[PDB]
Amino acid sequence: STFGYVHGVSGPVVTACDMAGAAMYELVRVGHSELVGEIIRLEGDMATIQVYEETSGVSVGDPVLRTGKPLSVELGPGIMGAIFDGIQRPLSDISSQTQSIYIPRGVNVSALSRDIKWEFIPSKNLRVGSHITGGDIYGIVNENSLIKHKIMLPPRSRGSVTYIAPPGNYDASDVVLELEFEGVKEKLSMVQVWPVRQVRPVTEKLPANHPLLTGQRVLDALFPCVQGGTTAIPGAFGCGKTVISQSLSKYSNSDVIIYVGCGERGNEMSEVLRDFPELTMEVDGKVESIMKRTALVANTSNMPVAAREASIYTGITLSEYFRDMGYHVSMMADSTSRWAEALREISGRLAEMPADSGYPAYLGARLASFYERAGRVKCLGNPEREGSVSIVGAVSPPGGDFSDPVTSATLGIVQVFWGLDKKLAQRKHFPSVNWLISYSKYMRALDEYYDKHFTEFVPLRTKAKEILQEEEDLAEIVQLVGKASLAETDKITLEVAKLIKDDFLQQNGYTPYDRFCPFYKTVGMLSNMISFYDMARRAVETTAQSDNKITWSIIREHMGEILYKLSSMKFKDPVKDGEAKIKADYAQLLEDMQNAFRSLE
Amino acid sequence: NYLSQPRLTYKTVSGVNGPLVILDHVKFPRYAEIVHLTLPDGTKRSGQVLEVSGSKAVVQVFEGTSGIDAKKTSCEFTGDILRTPVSEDMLGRVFNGSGKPIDRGPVVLAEDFLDIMGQPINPQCRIYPEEMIQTGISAIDGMNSIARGQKIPIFSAAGLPHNEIAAQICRQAGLVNFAIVFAAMGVNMETARFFKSDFEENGSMDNVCLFLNLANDPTIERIITPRLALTTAEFLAYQCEKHVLVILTDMSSYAEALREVSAAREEVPGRRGFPGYMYTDLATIYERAGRVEGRNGSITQIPILTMPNDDITHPIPDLTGYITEGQIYVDRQLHNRQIYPPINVLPSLSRLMKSAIGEGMTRKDHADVSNQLYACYAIGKDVQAMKAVVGEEALTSDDLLYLEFLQKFEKNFITQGPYENRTVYETLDIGWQLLRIFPKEMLKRIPQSTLSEFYPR
C-alpha cells in the first residue's frame, strides 16, 4: 500500500509508520489536509519526514501518502508566462482558482494545466516501427508566436514506436506516443517529470565561444560574457541591478529567460512581478511581450524554507529543459546569498555541525555543482542541435566583505564579475559598472570570434583599458603637479580618458537612440576615440623634441569641432540610421580628423 | 589463494541516515570490506564498511544514499577490502575518480590486484633523495631546488595560474623521461580540458595516466581518487622501476570532501571544523613518495592546493606544510602585477634542496648565492615597507640599493614567460648579476673564498 500513518509530531518533524519500502528523499503527503514533506531518515518500517508547511493540528494516526518521486519538475507545454514558487506551485493559478490573497496549507494544483488543449504536430517522417532514443523530438506544440515547444522523448527512455498521434488538439493528459522495448511498453503524453537535483544529460559538453550581447557598451566591449558562461553581480540596494535584468530580458541574443527569486522581501518581489509582464520587445517588426519567452520562480522570505533552497534547482532544471530543445537560455538568480541562508537554516534544523560561519560543510560543493550546469552542449537524441544555459547570479556580501563564505566561493567559481557600484550610481553615471574592479576571463575564448567578425576590436579594447588605467595612475599626481605642469601626452591621456568615461561608458537606456547599442556601433565609436588618441600622441611626439611643439591646448584650439563630433557619435540611431549610414558617418569623422591633424603636422 | 566460496546477498537494511546505510543479520562482518548495492530501479552503487558490531555493519555509499529504501534495496558483500586492478597498460588511459574507463577503451586486464590503502615503507629501506630535477623555472631551481623523490606542493588560490605552472613543470622536468600520473578532485570542465589538451599538444599523452572526478561527480569518490592514483604510481615505480611524477589537483577538494564525510559520523572536530585526524589522513597520501633500496624507480609528488581566502594558517595549507618537504607559494600580489610565474620566494621552501646542490651536484656557489638572494629580497621588502611611511627623501643610498635590487630581481630572476627553460647555470649567473649591484662587503651571507672567485666576472 502507498499509505503509512503518523506515529508522532514535534515541530516540522513528522515520524510515520507502515512506511516500509519508502525511499530516501521521496516526497510525501501528510495529514487529511495533505501537507508536503520529504523523507530524511529510514529505520525499520518507520520514516522521519521533514514537513515543509505548518504541522499545527496534525494528529497521531493521520494518513501519510508516499509519492514515488523525489523533488521533481513537470516539464512540458505551458511553462512560458508561468509564475512558480521554488517547488513549482503555480502562484497565478492558485490565486485564480482559490479566489484568495493567501496560499492554502496543502494546496494541490498541478504545475501545468491538464485543462488546456495544445495544437500538436508530429515529426512527419516518424512511422510505426521507427527506432527512437532519449532526447528525440517526436512533435511540436505551437505554444505562442515566439516559442515552438518541441516535444522530446525523456532521457532514460527508448524503443520501437508502436503508436503516434495524428495532428490535432490534445490535453496534457492525452497519450500522444507509445513505444515498446524488450516487449515492455511505455505510453507518453506531452509532459515529462525530472528530479531537480539530477543534471539533465547531453551527448557532449562544449567550450563556450559566441558572446552573449546585452546591448550595453561597457559589458559587451570591456567585460564580455559568452553564451554558456557564468557571471556574478553585487546584489545591493543603490547599485541599480535592473539594467542587467532588463538588458538580458529585452535585448540579449538569448532565446528563453528564466528568473529566480531565492528569498526576497515581500515588497521587492512585488516590483519584479509588477514590472516583468509590462516589458516588451520588437520581433518581426511587431511588438511582443517579454512573457512569451520567460518564466518566473518567485519566493518571498516567508515561503517554506525548502522552497527557498530548491529555488535555484527548479530554475536550472527548467533552463536545462529548453537547452535540450536547441535553444539558448539565460538564467538570473536574484540573490544566491538568500539561497545559502535557506541552506544554513535547513542544516541547522537537521542539527548538522556548523563548519565555517555557521554554513554547512558542503556549501562550496553545492555552489560548484550548481554553476557547473552552465555551458554550451550538443543535445541528446536524433535531430542534430546545440543549445546552452548561461547563469547570472547575484551575491550580497555583508557591508561589501568579499571574505564571506558564499561570496568567496562564488567569486572563486564564476568567470565574470560585473561590479555594479553605488558610488558611481550617486553621480548619475549609468550603467553603474566599476571598470577598475569589474573583469571577464572569457577573452582567450572569444578571441577567434572577434578575429573573424570584427578584427580591429581586440587592439582597441586593449588601448582603451590602458587609457582607463593611466587616468587612475595620474589621479594622485595631478593633485601635486597642479594639472598645468603635466606632460602634453598625459594631458591627452586625461582628456581622452574623460571622453571615453563620459561618452563611451555612459549609456542612458531611456533615450531612444541608446536603449540598445549594437556591436558594430560599439566598435565604430571606440575605433574613432582610439584613432584620435594615436593621432594626438603622434602630433606631440613628432614635435616635442625641439619644435614650437604641439600641446593639448593647441589640439583643442585647432580641432574643437572634431572633439565635439566625437562626443556626438553616441547619438547615432539604429532605428532610423542604417548600418551603412552609421559606418559612413564614423568613416567621415576619421577622414575629417586626419585632414585636421595633417593641417597641424 | 582465490576466494572460492560464494558471496552472500542481503535485503536486511535496517536503517538509512546521511551518507550511511545500516545492515543487520550480517554473517561475520569484515571491517573496511566493499559492498555492492542494487537499488529498486536497478541502479548499482558501491560502499565500504565503516563500522561493525555483532550482526550489524555500517556502510558509507560512494554515490550517496538518495533513493535507497529499507525493503527492495539489496546488498552483496565481496568478501574483501578495496583493491584496484593494475597493469603497465594504464599509461595512455583516462579513468573517472573510481577507476572506471572514460576514454571508450576496455577495462584493465590486471597484472596484479593491489590494496588501495598502500602499506607503510620501512624507514630502513628509504633512500634519501639527492638527484636535483631542473624544472627550468628560476624561482624553483635557484631558490627551492626539487630533488627526485620529493613531496613539494604548490600553495595557490582561486584565480591564480597554478594549473599553468604545474603544466610547465610537467613539460620541462629533467635531471641537471618521467611517467605522469594525474588525479583531479572537483575540477570544472575547462580545468579538465586544459591538462588533457596540454598533454596531447606536447605529444606526451601515451605516457600519462589521468583520473578525473569533476565538480558534478560524487564527493566521496574524491577520498579514494588520490589512493587509486598513488597505487598506480607505486606499481609503476616500485615494480616496473619507472620514475613517476604524481600530480594531485586541488587537495582542498579532498579535504572538503573528508570534512563532509566526517561531519556525518560526528567524529571529534579540529580547527575550522575539519576532522581531528586530518593530519594523519593527509600523511597517508603524502608519505607515498620517494626512493627505496635496491629498486631504480621513484615517486615525486606535486599536490596543488587552493588556500581559502589566501590564508596560509588555514588547516589545509597548515597541516600540509607540516608533512610535505617544502612548498611553492603562488602570490596574488605578483599575479595582479602581471608577472609570470607569480612565485613569491619568501613563504616558499624546499627541505631536500640543502643536499641536492653545491660542488659536484650543481656549482660550488649555489648554496651561498641562494641564501644571499633571500637576504637581499627580505631587506628590499623591509625598505619598501619603510618607504610607504616616511617617503623617498628619508631613504639613504644603502636603502636605495636594496630597493633597486628588488625591482631587478622580480623582472630578471622571477619573471620568465610560459615556455622559457633556463638551465641551473643561467639561473645562478642571473643570480650573481643582481648581487653584483651591492659593494661586496654588504654580501654578509657569502664567505671571502666564494666572493673572490665569482663576484669579479
Describe this structure in words.
This is part of a larger assembly, with chains A (601 residues) and B (457 residues). With 601 residues, chain A is an alpha+beta fold. Helices cover 33% and strands 23% of the residues of chain A. Chain A has 15 helices and 30 strands. In chain A, the strands form seven sheets. In chain A, strands 8, 18, 21, 22, 25, 26, 27, 28, 29 and 30 form a ten-stranded mixed beta sheet that branches. In chain A, helix 7 runs parallel beside helix 8 and helix 14 (552-567) runs antiparallel to helix 15 (579-598). The longest helix of chain A has 25 residues, at 457-481. Chain A is elongated. The N and C termini of chain A lie far apart (94 Å). The relative contact order of chain A is 0.09. Chain B has 457 residues and is α/β, with parallel strands linked by helices. Chain B has one domain (2-457): Rossmann fold, CATH 3.40.50.12240. In chain B, 32% of the residues lie in helices and 23% in strands. Chain B has helices spanning 138-141, 162-172, 189-201, 225-238, 251-265, 278-286, 315-323, 332-336, 353-356, 366-390, 397-414, 424-435, 448-454; strands at residues 9-10, 13-17, 20-23, 33-38, 44-53, 56-61, 74-81, 83-86, 93-96, 112-115, 126-127, 132-134, 146-147, 154-156, 174-175, 179-187, 208-214, 243-249, 290-292, 298-306, 326-329, 349-350. In chain B, the strands form four sheets. In chain B, strands 9, 11, 14, 16, 17, 18, 19, 20, 21 and 22 form a ten-stranded mixed beta sheet that branches. In chain B, strands 1-7-4-5-6-3-2 form a seven-stranded antiparallel beta sheet, with no helix packed on it. In chain B, helix 10 crosses helix 12. At the A-B interface, strand 4, helix 7 and helix 8 of A face strand 2, helix 3 and helix 5 of B. The PDB classes it as proton transport. The entry lists the keywords V-ATPase, Complex, Membrane protein.
